[PDB]
Amino acid sequence: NMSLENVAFNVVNKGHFDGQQGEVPVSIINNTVYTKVDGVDVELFENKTTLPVNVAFELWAKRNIKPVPEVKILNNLGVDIAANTVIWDYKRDAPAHISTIGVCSMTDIAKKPTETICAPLTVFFDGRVDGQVDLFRNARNGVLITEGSVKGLQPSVGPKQASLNGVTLIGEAVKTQFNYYKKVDGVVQQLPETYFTQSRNLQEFKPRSQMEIDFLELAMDEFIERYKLEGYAFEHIVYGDFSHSQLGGLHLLIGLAKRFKESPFELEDFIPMDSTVKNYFITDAQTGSSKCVCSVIDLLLDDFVEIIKSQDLSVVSKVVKVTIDYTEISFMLWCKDGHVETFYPKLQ
Amino acid sequence: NMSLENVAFNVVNKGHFDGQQGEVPVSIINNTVYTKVDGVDVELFENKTTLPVNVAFELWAKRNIKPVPEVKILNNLGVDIAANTVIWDYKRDAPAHISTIGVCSMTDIAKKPTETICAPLTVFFDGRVDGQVDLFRNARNGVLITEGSVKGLQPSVGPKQASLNGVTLIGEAVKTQFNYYKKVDGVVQQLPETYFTQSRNLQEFKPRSQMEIDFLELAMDEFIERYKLEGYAFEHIVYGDFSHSQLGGLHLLIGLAKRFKESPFELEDFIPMDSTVKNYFITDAQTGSSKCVCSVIDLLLDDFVEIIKSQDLSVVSKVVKVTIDYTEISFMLWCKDGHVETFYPKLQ
Amino acid sequence: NMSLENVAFNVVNKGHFDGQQGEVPVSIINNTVYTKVDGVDVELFENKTTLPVNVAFELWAKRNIKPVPEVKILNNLGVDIAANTVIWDYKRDAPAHISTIGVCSMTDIAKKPTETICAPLTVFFDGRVDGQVDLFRNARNGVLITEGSVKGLQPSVGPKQASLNGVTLIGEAVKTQFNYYKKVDGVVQQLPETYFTQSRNLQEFKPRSQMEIDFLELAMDEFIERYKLEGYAFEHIVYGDFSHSQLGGLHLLIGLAKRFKESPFELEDFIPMDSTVKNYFITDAQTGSSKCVCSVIDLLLDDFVEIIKSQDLSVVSKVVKVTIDYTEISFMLWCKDGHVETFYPKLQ
Amino acid sequence: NMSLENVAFNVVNKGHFDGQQGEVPVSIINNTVYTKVDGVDVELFENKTTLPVNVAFELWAKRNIKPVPEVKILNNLGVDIAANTVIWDYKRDAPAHISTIGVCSMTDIAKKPTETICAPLTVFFDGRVDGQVDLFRNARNGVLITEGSVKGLQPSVGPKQASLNGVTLIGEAVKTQFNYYKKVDGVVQQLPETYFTQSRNLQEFKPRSQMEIDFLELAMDEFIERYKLEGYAFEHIVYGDFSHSQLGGLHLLIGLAKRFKESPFELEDFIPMDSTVKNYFITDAQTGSSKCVCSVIDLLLDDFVEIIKSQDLSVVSKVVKVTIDYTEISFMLWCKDGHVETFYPKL
Amino acid sequence: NMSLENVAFNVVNKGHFDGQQGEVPVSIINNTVYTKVDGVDVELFENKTTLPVNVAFELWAKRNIKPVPEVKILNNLGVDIAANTVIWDYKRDAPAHISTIGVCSMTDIAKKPTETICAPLTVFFDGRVDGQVDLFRNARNGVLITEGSVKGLQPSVGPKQASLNGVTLIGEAVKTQFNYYKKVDGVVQQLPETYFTQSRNLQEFKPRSQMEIDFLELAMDEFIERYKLEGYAFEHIVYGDFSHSQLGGLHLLIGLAKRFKESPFELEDFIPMDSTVKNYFITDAQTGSSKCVCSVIDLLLDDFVEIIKSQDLSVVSKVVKVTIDYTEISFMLWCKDGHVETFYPKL
Ligand SMILES: O=c1ccn([C@@H]2O[C@H](CO)[C@@H](OP(=O)(O)O)[C@H]2O)c(=O)[nH]1
Ligand SMILES: O=c1ccn([C@@H]2O[C@H](CO)[C@@H](OP(=O)(O)O)[C@H]2O)c(=O)[nH]1
Ligand SMILES: O=c1ccn([C@@H]2O[C@H](CO)[C@@H](OP(=O)(O)O)[C@H]2O)c(=O)[nH]1
Ligand SMILES: O=c1ccn([C@@H]2O[C@H](CO)[C@@H](OP(=O)(O)O)[C@H]2O)c(=O)[nH]1
Ligand SMILES: O=c1ccn([C@@H]2O[C@H](CO)[C@@H](OP(=O)(O)O)[C@H]2O)c(=O)[nH]1
Ligand code: NA
Ligand code: NA
């Protein structure tokens, strides 16, 4: 069940825990696990978690190495724990969940998700593993992903992308789009209509629609005229205003990506975790414009246009609710004289 | 006055300390501050200072987030402490000064700079803050920056650039060029004529004059002929000599920047701090030429040309003094038969 | 013999230990050595070794700063210890050897390699240092490098590249190709014929033959036809197969380098050390193809072609032995119907 | 205004957390909490727990400073968590329980014991606190102590002693004997009839009956004759046999106390925690007799005599179950020819 | 040739820093200093301070090993720093002062006390060291101790006891009673008339007057009658009241010493530092009586009797100021009907 030296043997020989027999010599110093290779010590793992170093080492070695839902999705769906696996949170360099089921003797609260202690918890089930669909059917609270149809259950089509060893990708050699199912108190839920964030990053941003291609290629005024965006404050919200000491707008990742290719800037990720909305302390290196809390979301530009064009613009300020990544994201909408002033998501 | 959980609340909600009421749960493990977000721990701060972790966390959260003088300037002007702010040293990942005034109960030596304990110390005053010009007028020892004129005081025009959240920049949406004033023992000082370093970096180096543009674009022999630099050893001092085991010359940042675009090399910053002169252990990857102590300064090329063309070349070796960043920098000048052999700054 | 403050003085003033007299104030906190510079603490060294922080600091300061053999070569030749120097292992951020000879009072097992305790150990001798060739002649077990001929000893021509301050390079201003000699139990050995790995890296990979230039420039099918590689599974072994969930082949660095310029991927170096064969956990970001243990070797493409074209292809699977970096590397060769299926090195 | 600096203010000014307003400067280094007193740092708390230093500091400051059941009693009753207090485990220098209810934002799983997350946990309730008897009635799983009767509930009289700030004592100025009640799955459970251990220690051991006074003062042969203990191997079980390399017997604390006054020995407490039965690696300094696992229990000698005399001595070896401190303690009984060879508890 | 390895050489060979030449190999791990002795590591120093381990090691090695004033005296006199020595605080296992003068490159603010940076600090000067009386005369702020008269300066006779390597003692082979002098803002300051605490401890408490001998040997009623202490609540203040849940009185160390010989109790020193008044969280093991903040002072019983008998007993409650160890100690006096209820010092 447990053996630090056997975990290290699997890491050295298989790249992760693979259930192989064997042992290697291990040193633990502070928060770092070493193994002896021909007379000298080689670092295997640096603990960045709040768990004991040897426990975090084992959970990391036993991480799920298939494509799995991004942590923000599991969090938004209320997942508390995973059935017989570890979802490793690469944004936090730590397990996504505090406890485990049938993984590690120090963190297990149960060997199987059918045990009583798991009933009030929302357990994550993976239909790609034999028997887990049936475990979901019998579980009181849970979230299930599948690659195909489940008899008698209507699916919710999830995002196109998933996380594979910390790399978020849309799979071509592997399936990353899952069907989602959720049960609460033994009742199968109808998951709401939702947008999905695109989980792209600033430096290798790639467009996923013709509008996004046009946004990156065309000048600001050409793009706004082509897609008839006059009065929606896209100059402020998406392109960003760098003329004053406080940086204006800049709430869509594609706008940051366009600026970054032209002029670099600093993004301080002061709450480093996976979430649908991200807050950054941004400092523009060219102008000196800055903002302590700049909320950023990566929506497909077409989706963001649909959202802002579907709002009433008759009051000065109000909260707009948008279902994104299965959760209700609050946006602040500021208007003046029937046109938009700004529109930004809130991290909550 | 003091509350670790309130500091963390401000960091999470405002990106820095903003004087807001509230608390979040905090964990301190070794030298890392965490906060609990929906059942899991998220890292807020890793202490790299020699201060206690919770104290360094508070000083970092209370850092000045306006454009401020670079630490090398404050050090050269003899600044010991700041009035009611924290100058964060991003080169050292630590406070620029050991003690504080009216910032933190663990590090404060006073609540106000008018207290007796501050009289012998050179206190930094910021004229952009209400009342600090008057505090400078009454202070015994101090350095004051302003954006405009001060009645009855002659200013010293400082560098064009300043530091904003660790980004050194010439402000366009914000003012980064300050007037400087200094008092010693109650007497307003005449600050000397000085050159200023340009605070650029190796990889995104940008020219700031036509001579620098020509240096980057033209070949070595074309540039030297155009600006009539024969006999000043620019081939050695600025371009660098990579033909022997010991790397020759290479003491101006623009010369390193030109080499780096053509051929990468290793720069070991073995004294990592902000200073007018920097010493690097350099290893050229293409040739294997190396040098344990390679002194580098980032002067505007036009300024460096003026300096070296203003020296007497009649002795084999001597020390040349140049006022740079308000301090007296010693250069070694080596000559032979009336022409320069080398010319380099000394870190002292 | 020993002085922590004197080691730090040499680091600050000379960039490494240089035998100079002097002292600076030092702070040791956890695993970090600091020195006080004008009232504030500056980090000099962060200990990443399993040694005490002050001991590792001294060994790092006393590292060899000339071109030295890469650690993988010394390990393959059985080197246990170095004569009167420290070979710093930049892959491990630690000394390459556990003990020293005449370097450090905490780690020395002897002052001179002629002492009895060194006789059973394979001592590394550097012919560029006065007297070390003669010490090798009198030593029982040892490895010697020279830049030129040694009277009465036949040399083995080593690799073209060597390590200079952690930068692996083929020297142009300095000599990096050494003659190698080895003695075991007082008997000079005949070192075997061997290939050498090229020690290049993924991102600045440079071809070293016309075949490698053609591999990077031509399309897959053009290159295979030009060099008549039909039936040798180069599409699988070198170019890689990204069509299935398990990534196929990709065992030569030049193939990874070609893929990386076109499409980025993740390489997890889960045994971070210097070795002739490297194992990576690879995840392709474009396709999602991945493999937990992907063995990679950087052979000159011409050498790899010679190796695979010199094998018998008549059995389904067998182990092939290839002398590389002076050690016997085991390759697995898989064949079907007289053609290659795959061919990969094993890390052992 | 809950804060690290406010916790430290209460410790400095009140000796523990007392809900007072105020702050003092705090430094956290080396898993230790310091406060600044006239320019220099004074240590307030060294963390010996597996919790973060600032969290353990707060739980320690918020420890219950009234007499509370010993941790071994709470463990034997299956207590998982306490309602709105912290039971500090002075044998482990750590909280007795991992989580809290309405104590600390970092460790709370709930603010009140009525929340659903507490239902499957056995919550400790203190009838001396207003409202906690009613919370016990509504809790699905729990343990309740009171100083008096609770209408309708059948009580179990607990041990005479309790723990006050880490001092186990029989209260004279305070009450330390409580009624006990327990609920499992929403149903009140009958607590078993039980002996209680005496919770004494080697150095300041004091007899609590005439038989224990006789054992300490009389010689071995005289005591066994007076209390008619022939055939029960008291020479082995209680007095101990130091004649062989392996130390024989010595399973009652009073026997260790008698030996210790005569000749010192080493007791390695290799599982340092509060428990009804303790295991020690014992080395006798005079003879060199030793034993890696010597199980020791502190029963009133009268109780142990009552237990062993009630045994059937016709079997070579059998396991005997005795309820002690509300838990079932297994004893190994070795006999030969109708007399006892040895009789020892198991951990 | 000042160095970490040279400090360790002096510790190993001389027991402290003695200015000798030499070096030994040193390892620094776990906030601890080791040296290699015949192949294995031997611990020389465990850092308990908030300074870096190698810095604290040097300051400890350079500690003053002559009799020096107790830290509570230096604190009460406002001492900020010492001239060319280290006063080691054995109650905190740390330097008594943050910075140094001419001791250690990492902590020095100056090489000599005459430097301008020292002028606003109260520097401790030791007249037993050549030149330090003259440095006191030139210092703007300072405290001076001497073994004899200084011409022109009016002395204050200090306590009989001093601290030698952490042992507080009244010297017989060495002098421990010093003259004291103090300067503020360049002006010599008259030190007040003062009592001194006796600096005794619970275990090895020894009486130092016939009244203290009587207190330990006589019964409570007999002692109060002989010394005519009726109406002064000595039963409460000194002997302590253990009859209620809250422990009453017990504010003089001699009263704790008398109780401790009779029955043990726990004293939690939750602010562990040297101070004229100490606060303890006390738990009586026999009765269970306890008190979170019990202020205790070790005055000669004759001095305490002199203090309390000089009091006006006509007010329900008032604060009484008494100069002790050169500082103003506030006492709370509670009276009723012309007799004392309680009388305790405040920290
Ligand atoms: O009258 C107001 C007040 C605030 N804001 C907007 O509210 C946000 C927080 O102050 C800012 O939006 P931004 O971050 O996109 O620039 C600001 O412009 C308005 O638009 N109008
Ligand atoms: O006769 C001498 C001795 C030294 N140097 C120069 O002094 C510096 C330190 O040795 C080197 O300058 P560099 O770093 O720019 O190459 C060296 O060339 C001379 O020019 N001439
Ligand atoms: O019948 C078999 C079994 C295994 N392999 C090969 O053996 C290796 C480990 O399974 C893989 O080679 P690769 O890493 O280059 O893809 C696999 O294709 C074969 O070629 N044929
Ligand atoms: O046949 C047996 C086997 C074991 N034991 C007893 O079982 C215990 C563990 O081996 C020992 O009892 P002690 O610790 O009190 O000396 C041993 O004497 C017997 O008495 N008889
Ligand atoms: O009316 C009052 C209020 C307080 N106290 C006393 O003040 C102290 C703190 O409450 C206690 O004194 P003790 O610690 O010596 O017992 C208490 O009895 C009185 O005597 N009378
Ligand atoms: Na339970
Ligand atoms: Na003072």
Author numbering:
A (entry chain A), B (entry chain A), C (entry chain A): 0 to 347
D (entry chain B), E (entry chain B): 0 to 346
From the study:
Surprisingly, the uracil base is anchored by Trp333 in the guanine site observed in the Nsp15/5′GpU complex, confirming that this site can accommodate purine and pyrimidine bases. The 3′-phosphoryl group occupies the phosphate ion site created by His235, His250, and Thr341, as observed in Nsp15/5′GpU. It is surprising that uracil does not go into its dedicated site, but the result demonstrates higher affinity for the base in the Trp333 site than in uracil-recognition site, potentially governed by the strong stacking interactions with the aromatic side chain that take precedence over hydrogen bonds observed in the uracil binding of 5′UMP. The identity of the Trp333-interacting base is irrelevant, especially given that the enzyme’s substrate is most likely a larger RNA molecule. The position of phosphate ion or 3′-phosphoryl group of 3′UMP is also preserved. Then, the available Trp333 base binding site can accept base on the 3′ end of the uridine moiety, somewhat resembling our Nsp15/3′UMP structure.
The Nsp15 enzyme is active as a 234 kDa hexamer consisting of three dimers. It was reported that NendoU cleaves both single- and double-stranded RNA at uridine sites producing 2′,3′-cyclic phosphodiester and 5′-hydroxyl termini. To evade host pattern recognition receptor MDA5 responsible for activating the host defenses, the Nsp15 cleaves the 5′-polyuridine tracts in (-) sense viral RNAs, which are the product of polyA-templated RNA synthesis. In addition to biochemical data, we report five new structures of the enzyme in complex with 5′UMP, 3′UMP, 5′GpU, uridine 2′3′-vanadate (UV)—a transition state analog, and Tipiracil—a uracil derivative.
